[PDB]
Design a protein around this nucleic acid. Structure first.
Lengths: 100, 353, 417
RNA sequence: CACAUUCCAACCACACCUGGCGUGUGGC
């Protein structure tokens, strides 16, 4: 299965995810000073064919999303500042997110 | 978009345990809370997502009162000439339309409130479907034990709570056994556990007879009076409508065949099965049974009953904690007095003498 | 002490036994916890234990001997045995073993077997020399299992009618096709009572899968022998566990030249369970059912056969139809013709509230001349020809009246001549 | 008989990342 840039990051609270948008990208103008997940990158580790009904269920009910690996990119420990711009490039064929 | 709304209404697990109408009601509440959190001002809104024909459209409720605080949701009871109200109360407007229901905080609050609403609705439904059987013995496993209350499962996610007062002082539970009690209280508005099952109450006893004694249930041996001391002693006065049936041979059983069973059910409770009578004297004599009562004094002005027991049978008429009298005071409901032993042996032919 | 004598007694007996043992207030713990404490107290006086348990193996290598109190699940009373004993005495799942056991020693927490005494009620000599189940040769039934009691009471009808509707043989592959709330519970109660009265030699087995506890206790106090059950207090894990346990027990018995007759109810719930536990292989068909998920129920229905040299394994499973679940529909469809005996119950006759409610034209047995004699078969043919033109309710009332004036089937036979 | 272990209310164990090598540029 391919990777996802959704905002469903398990094994973490909302404070670390408060800076993320609905699509899964840090807002334009959201500051950051320490290691903080600014993009919701997840990758499947086991079985594919996660039904969308069960996907929304896990998003609302049930257990956490298993095959994520929490491989999201965060800013390195030591760099600070406020993000001012975000670019995104989608290959012809993949569903363009609403931020794009 | 609304296609996501259709996907989430058709992708629910409990599809009919939470109908589409209540689905969309909870979703409207979600969107209203989201729009409330959007603006810094407080303004109640309705959504009306148009379950099947179209999309949502937010509104603006006025909550018509003569106040002015946060006039976003304030309007006088007489503003009815312009904007076409012609109203007295209930004047609501449809000013703001097409809010956003798919951003981060909106999705978060929607998920939270949908979880809350679905768990509340499931609990309410699973308690109401059993509420019709109030006052009956039900089976079921206990779920978790604690020093204040215990949890029970009746099957198909049927949560029941049994408080410490419903449990006997030495009543004992472990998750796995089928502790059977009687449903006595229901509270479909409770934010938490609302299925109340008891075993320390005399109605439980009644239901026990109903599941054990074939006489009761046909109204041939009516259960009239019942007092309890949890795990200690249950005094029950049952009357016989007919004449050729004796409760000592019918309600008690065959040399402790039914009373012993109900006692093991109640965890070793001495059950005194006596006959109900329309005379207070015989009633209180059977209440303190077994004993040798040789006195009766009644007072309807103070509702008191004096019973001067015989000298020597104290432990036979009072016993531990005075239970034989206390339950008697809890059987008929009058102040019973057991003081004299030798002198004033009658309290009627001697006190009045 | 023996474990079975702690098995057959109710909870109050354990209470008074612990009070005899000078134990703390034990009314709070499980029955198995009480048994464990009592066995520890007994062995503290320098005593050995005698136990009996059905054996089960995981991939972990070692084995567990379960009792019927928890319907063969893990518990503080089950015995732990090393893989060395399984390798030596040629043990396998379902092999009930009875013998000397000890309480858990220093650092241990479950019982351990010392010396085997009875392997499936047999010495280890012939237990190690056991013929394999699948290596056997199936046959058909000539030994007719007479369902008639002969007393002719009010309910015995539902049994004797089978003597003219669906003959029963040892190792028969039977399946019931019936809607809910029709009378299957009392039907299997009747069949169990009748087979126990007429054939007490064959070990009785009844499968209560995904049922209510009231039915559990009513059937555990009415069957004329040891029974197993399983309610819905646990997920499909317990159901599949008890299914494997009972199937391996029956296999080991019939390998020991036993006559096992299992009564399963209901099989659609077993199919649902096997569907729920088995992960999706990436292909699903109509009904939300996986393709190869039904392989386990298939196998369970295929285990029925007739051994050549001796012994048999009869399986009589009930299926649920008319429930509205299309899933269930498809399930029954998979079970269209897998068995050679069909017992069809219809809700239309049961709505007229006469019992039993037999679908004579729809029910029957394949290759039935090998079960009964020639005159009985000719009379069955005559009865079938007489019952074919008429309907079902009138035919049922006719059969009920004819078997109500008479008691044994010979009277009805000669009356039909 | 004996060796050796024994699979589960919070949680301890199941953690976290590219100088392989080269080139280019710049600074001390």
């Amino acid at each position: 299965g391919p990777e996802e840039i959704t905002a469903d990051i398990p094994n973490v609270g909302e404070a670390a995810l408060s800076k993320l948008d609905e699509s899964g990208i840090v807002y334009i103008g959201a500051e950051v000073t320490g290691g903080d997940i600014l993009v919701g990158k997840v990758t499947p580790k086991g079985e594919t064919q996660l039904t969308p009904e069960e996907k929304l269920l896990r998003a609302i009910f049930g257990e956490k999303a298993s095959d994520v690996k929490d491989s999201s990119l965060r800013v390195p420990n030591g760099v600070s500042g406020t993000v001012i711009d975000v670019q995104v490039f989608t290959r012809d064929g993949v569903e363009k997110d609403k931020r794009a | 978009m609304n296609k996501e709304i259709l996907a989430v209404v058709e992708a629910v697990s409990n599809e009919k345990a939470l109908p589409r109408e209540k689905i969309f009601e909870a979703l409207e509440s979600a969107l209203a809370t989201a729009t409330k959190k959007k603006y810094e001002q407080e303004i109640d809104v309705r959504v009306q997502i148009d379950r099947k024909s179209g999309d949502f459209d937010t509104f603006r409720r006025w909550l018509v009162v003569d106040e002015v605080t946060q006039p976003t949701k304030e309007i006088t009871l007489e503003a009815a000439r312009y904007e076409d109200e012609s109203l007295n109360l209930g004047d609501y407007v449809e000013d703001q339309i097409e809010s956003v229901t798919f951003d981060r905080i909106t999705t978060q609050t929607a998920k939270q409130v949908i979880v809350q609403k679905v768990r509340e609705a499931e609990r309410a439904m699973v308690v109401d479907q059993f509420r019709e059987h109030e006052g009956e013995i039900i089976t079921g496993v206990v779920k978790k034990v604690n020093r204040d209350n215990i949890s029970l499962d009746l099957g198909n996610n049927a949560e029941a709570v049994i408080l410490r007062e419903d449990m006997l002082p030495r009543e004992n539970f472990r998750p796995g056994d089928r502790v059977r009690g009687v449903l006595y209280s229901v509270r479909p508005e409770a934010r938490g556990a609302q299925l109340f099952v008891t075993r320390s109450k005399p109605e439980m006893l009644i239901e026990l007879f109903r599941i054990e004694v074939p006489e009761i249930g046909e109204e041939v041996i009516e259960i009239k009076a019942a007092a309890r001391d949890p795990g200690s002693r249950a005094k029950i006065a049952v009357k016989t409508n007919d004449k050729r049936i004796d409760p000592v041979g019918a309600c008690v059983g065959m040399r402790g065949a039914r009373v012993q069973a109900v006692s093991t059910e109640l965890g070793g409770e001495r059950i005194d099965i006596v006959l109900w009578d329309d005379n207070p004297a015989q009633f209180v004599i059977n209440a303190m049974a077994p004993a040798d009562v040789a006195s009766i004094v009644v007072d309807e002005d103070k509702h008191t009953m004096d019973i001067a027991v015989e000298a020597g049978n104290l432990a036979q008429a009072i016993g531990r904690n005075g239970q034989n009298v206390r339950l008697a005071s809890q059987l008929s409901g009058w102040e019973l007095n057991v003081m004299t032993v030798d002198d004033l042996q009658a309290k009627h032919q001697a006190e009045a003498h | 002490m023996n474990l079975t004598e702690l098995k057959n007694t109710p909870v109050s007996e354990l209470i008074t036994l612990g009070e005899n043992m000078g134990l703390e207030n034990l009314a709070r713990m499980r029955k198995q916890d009480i048994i464990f404490a009592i066995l520890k107290q007994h062995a503290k006086s320098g005593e050995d234990i005698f136990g009996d348990g059905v054996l089960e193996i995981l991939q972990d290598g070692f084995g567990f001997l379960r009792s019927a109190d928890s319907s063969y699940l893990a518990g503080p009373d089950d015995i732990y045995v090393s893989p060395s004993q399984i390798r030596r005495f040629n043990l396998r799942t379902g092999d009930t073993i009875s013998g000397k056991i000890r309480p858990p020693k220093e650092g241990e927490r479950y019982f351990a077997l010392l010396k085997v005494n009875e392997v499936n009620f047999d010495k280890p000599e012939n237990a190690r020399n056991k013929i394999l189940f699948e290596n056997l040769t199936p046959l058909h039934a000539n030994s007719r299992l007479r369902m008639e009691r002969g007393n002719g009471s009010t309910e015995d009808l539902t049994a004797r009618v089978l003597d003219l509707a669906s003959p029963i043989g040892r190792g028969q592959r039977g399946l019931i096709v019936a809607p809910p709330k029709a009378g299957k519970t009392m039907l299997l109660q009747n069949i169990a009572q009748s087979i126990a009265y007429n054939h007490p030699d064959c070990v009785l087995m009844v499968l209560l899968i995904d049922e209510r506890p009231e039915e559990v206790t009513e059937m555990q106090r009415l069957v004329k022998g040891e029974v197993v059950a399983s309610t819905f207090d646990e997920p499909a894990s317990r159901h599949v566990q008890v299914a494997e346990m009972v199937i391996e027990k029956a296999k080991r018995l019939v390998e020991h030249k036993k006559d096992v007759i299992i009564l399963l109810d209901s099989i659609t719930r077993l199919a649902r369970a096997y569907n729920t536990v088995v992960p999706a292989s990436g292909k699903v068909l109509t009904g939300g059912v996986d393709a190869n998920a039904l392989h386990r129920p298939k196998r369970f229905f295929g285990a029925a056969r007739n051994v050549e040299e001796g012994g048999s394994l009869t399986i009589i499973a009930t299926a649920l139809i008319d429930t509205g679940s299309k899933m269930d529909e498809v399930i029954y469809e998979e079970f269209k013709g897998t068995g050679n005996m069909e017992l069809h119950l219809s809700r239309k006759i049961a709505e007229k509230r006469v019992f039993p409610a037999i679908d004579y034209n729809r029910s029957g047995t394949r290759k039935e001349e090998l079960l009964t004699t020639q005159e009985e078969l000719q009379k069955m043919w005559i009865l079938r020809k007489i019952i074919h033109p008429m309907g079902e309710i009138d035919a049922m009332e006719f059969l009920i009246n004819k078997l109500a004036m008479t008691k044994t089937n010979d009277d009805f036979f000669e009356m039909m001549k």
